[PDB]
Structure of Retinol-binding protein 2:
Amino acid sequence: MTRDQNGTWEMESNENFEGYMKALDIDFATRKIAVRLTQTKVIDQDGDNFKTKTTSTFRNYDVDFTVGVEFDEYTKSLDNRHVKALVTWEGDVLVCVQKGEKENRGWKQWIEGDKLYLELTCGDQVCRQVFKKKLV
Ligand SMILES: CCCCCCCC/C=C\CCCCCCCC(=O)OC(CO)CO
């Protein structure tokens, strides 16, 4: 029973964020800033209802969803694309498929210990992020 992802989580590693961004066609001036930033993830979860915020000094991104309920996602101030998104549980891993113009786009997010793991995929690029839970 590790489905409870509530908390504030601070990034400690970010592997291949460059390649993921390039796969999304982010221009190199934007990538040059974005690759350097420490991200924070704030998750407010009530059962299968999620409200999430990913924040940095450069850009913030909010996405809210209910597990199992397809929704329209506009990735505003990221790559600015429209996708149909569905989040499901695979065991205690939260799995998102983002169907749209990019093939094999989505993410997977799960807890181990005091860490939150997030693997972002686009095409043949995978970015692996790890966040540490912030205290009180
Ligand atoms: C926002 C902080 C970084 C902003 C700088 C990046 C700008 C360059 C363009 C694209 C990179 C998109 C990468 C972030 C993916 C969104 C996070 C996300 O959807 O996470 C899920 C799972 O946590 C939310 O529930």
Remarks:
- The chain has one domain: 1-136.
- The CA atoms of residues 74 and 132 lie 27 Å apart.
- The longest strand covers residues 7-15.
- The radius of gyration is 14 Å.
